[PDB]
Ligand binder design. Structure first.
Ligand SMILES: *[C@@H]1O[C@H](CO)[C@@H](O[C@@H]2O[C@H](CO)[C@@H](O[C@@H]3O[C@H](CO)[C@@H](O)[C@H](O[C@H]4O[C@H](CO)[C@@H](O)[C@H](O)[C@@H]4O)[C@@H]3O)[C@H](O)[C@H]2NC(C)=O)[C@H](O)[C@H]1NC(C)=O
Ligand SMILES: *[C@@H]1O[C@H](CO)[C@@H](O[C@@H]2O[C@H](CO)[C@@H](O[C@@H]3O[C@H](CO)[C@@H](O)[C@H](O[C@H]4O[C@H](CO)[C@@H](O)[C@H](O)[C@@H]4O)[C@@H]3O)[C@H](O)[C@H]2NC(C)=O)[C@H](O)[C@H]1NC(C)=O
Ligand SMILES: *[C@@H]1O[C@H](CO)[C@@H](O[C@@H]2O[C@H](CO)[C@@H](O)[C@H](O)[C@H]2NC(C)=O)[C@H](O)[C@H]1NC(C)=O
Ligand SMILES: *[C@@H]1O[C@H](CO)[C@@H](O[C@@H]2O[C@H](CO)[C@@H](O)[C@H](O)[C@H]2NC(C)=O)[C@H](O)[C@H]1NC(C)=O
Ligand SMILES: *[C@@H]1O[C@H](CO)[C@@H](O[C@@H]2O[C@H](CO)[C@@H](O)[C@H](O)[C@H]2NC(C)=O)[C@H](O)[C@H]1NC(C)=O
Ligand code: NAG
Lengths: 118, 142, 252, 116
């Protein structure tokens, strides 16, 4: 968990990036978002065509604070005008310190990717 | 001592590839067959060289273009890279390394051909150069 | 003797079949390249074969690079011997194969853009040109230019209609019904129909029709007549219809 | 904008004022039919007009034909661009004019018989 994870230093994942086509089907494991992109995922459904993707996704609900353990959340995906139209399963865990980890699964259909709010 | 000389010959093709990169800074390749973009999106493509003798040979793009079909000799061409230099009349065109090393990359804002065309293909033509025999860096100005 | 050289991307392989080298007199094959350490080995692709492998570089095993404007040639020399020391006759296979320096590469993925579009719709209408003509000679081969034509009742009367408009291949000029009226206007009450309801009015035997509704032009022949009363003017008219030559037929 | 379309007896043409499109922002225009070989050209009758000419038939330059029981229509799409590549504001002028199937004809010559 907090010690066994792969970092992602990507500055194009922020909710400010123009538009891309990247889709994350090879994302496997627990990740620690690091860099100018941000440390935590999106908390509200970000508008369409952002995060270097056509249909970005977001973590629905609120992040768990310190000392919460393993939590189950369902990362919704905004597309076509109906926020959270496809669903993916994520497992967030807080960490000792100012950072998080996520169980990043593959979205059901490609041209979906996660964001990080700066 | 007398010698007998048998002379034989042959021909071979180096291997040069093209790939579409899913991210800026050209990090991961694309494993799809058709990609749907918006015209406001940038395009991040590049060429590799797997043939061999990368020490003496530097990959370099003499000319690259786009055609609305798979056919590469199509009369309709938009020269993305014209005569070893990136297009200057289009501001959204930039190259990173052309002839510097064994891999060349460039980026172009996506377009769509005017008329009854709904697809855009890409084709370059590569000219390998010797790193030490001659000077390969293309530096052009208006 | 058979030679097979595969000048691959980075491997230059020279091979000689041992099944023939045995019969050639070499009971044990020594396969030295220009560098004595690039000794040959055994492989089996189509049969038991001996071969050497030299990387396609500048001097990994003695290869020498010769550069031309359009090609790069990699030169080397083989060496054969039935033992370590030769006295009878040296054997050298001066093998070399060149690569090109001008290639073409194509992106293998179709790339489809999307963009917002606006569609302004503009309409209109035109008219197919159909002109009616008078023939004063048989076989329908000579038109009449004058405005006024005076001809006896007994003599026949030949009238032709021809479609001048485009798309002649797709459209055949049908002739719904013709009539003759003693006035320029087509609204006149008393009329003399020549062809009634797509087929000729046959109550008068002096009427005959040729090539009606089959080509771009139709025609008919009808005897001259005098309207009852003090009507010395006969202005005949007709209206035509167009058929789709494949969906239906215009033969009545 | 302005689009004058005259549906002639044999062929149809769509014309656009050069001054109007120059003011609209197109220095040089590319008029493309359903097939790009019907590129627009220049012709002047009362002002500068850039125009396209298409035969009024089924297929000579992509003109679709769909005839119903009473009229027959010849529909072709038009494309306009200030360059070879469109990058924003793709423009399509969907033009079509229909011809009637029922027409009236009459001789222009006065006839005069006589009976003894
Ligand atoms: C720079 O160097 C390149 C690489 O060598 C060179 O290309 C060579 O051109 C020569 C001249 O034509 C070719 O020489 C061969 O010589 C004999 C006849 O003299 C034949 O073996 C060849 O003809 C055959 O060519 C084909 C076989 O590959 C077949 O069509 C057929 O069998 C012909 O008979 C040929 O003439 C030599 O083969 C090529 N090298 C290749 C093709 O790899 C180039 O010309 C040089 N440029 C200069 C000097 O400006
Ligand atoms: C067979 O197909 C033909 C050709 O498509 C069709 O004739 C069309 O009829 C419709 C319905 O009347 C017309 O549609 C137009 O639609 C809008 C309004 O909805 C207007 O542009 C038109 O009204 C105009 O009418 C006059 C035209 O100048 C003017 O008074 C004025 O501009 C009005 O706005 C019109 O309603 C269409 O234009 C015609 N096509 C013509 C006239 O060429 C026909 O009805 C079909 N027959 C069938 C289905 O049985
Ligand atoms: C995130 O957490 C889950 C739950 O611990 C990990 O394992 C999955 O557990 C469910 C429930 O039994 C299984 O159905 C899944 O098959 C498990 N996943 C795999 C890949 O086997 C899950 O792996 C974690 N995800 C990441 C991306 O690390
Ligand atoms: C690629 O495009 C050309 C042009 O459309 C195709 O047709 C050839 O056109 C050239 C002139 O451009 C003629 O000289 C040739 O005779 C045409 N035929 C051939 C077979 O070359 C050409 O066929 C297309 N190639 C492929 C592989 O589809
Ligand atoms: C052509 O002339 C006639 C005769 O003056 C005009 O009026 C028609 O007259 C006939 C015979 O009485 C009637 O059957 C028609 O109904 C009349 N048509 C009308 C009133 O519209 C006729 O209008 C003239 N036609 C034209 C096109 O001018
Ligand atoms: C995810 O959380 C959002 C934000 O409160 C909520 O609207 C949505 O219903 C949640 N998703 C599901 C599947 O309940």
């Amino acid at each position: 968990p907090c010690q066994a994870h792969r970092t992602l230093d990507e500055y194009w994942r922020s909710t400010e990036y123009g538009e891309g086509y990247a889709c994350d089907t090879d994302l496997r494991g627990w990740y620690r978002f690091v860099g100018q992109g941000g440390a935590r995922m999106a908390e509200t459904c970000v508008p369409v065509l952002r995060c270097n993707t056509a249909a970005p996704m977001w973590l629905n609900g609120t992040h768990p604070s310190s000392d919460e353990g393993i939590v189950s959340r369902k990362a919704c995906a905004h597309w076509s005008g109906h926020c959270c139209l496809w669903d993916a399963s994520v497992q967030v865990k807080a960490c000792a310190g100012g950072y998080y980890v996520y169980n990043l699964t593959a979205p059901p259909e490609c041209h979906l990717a996660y964001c990080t709010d700066p």
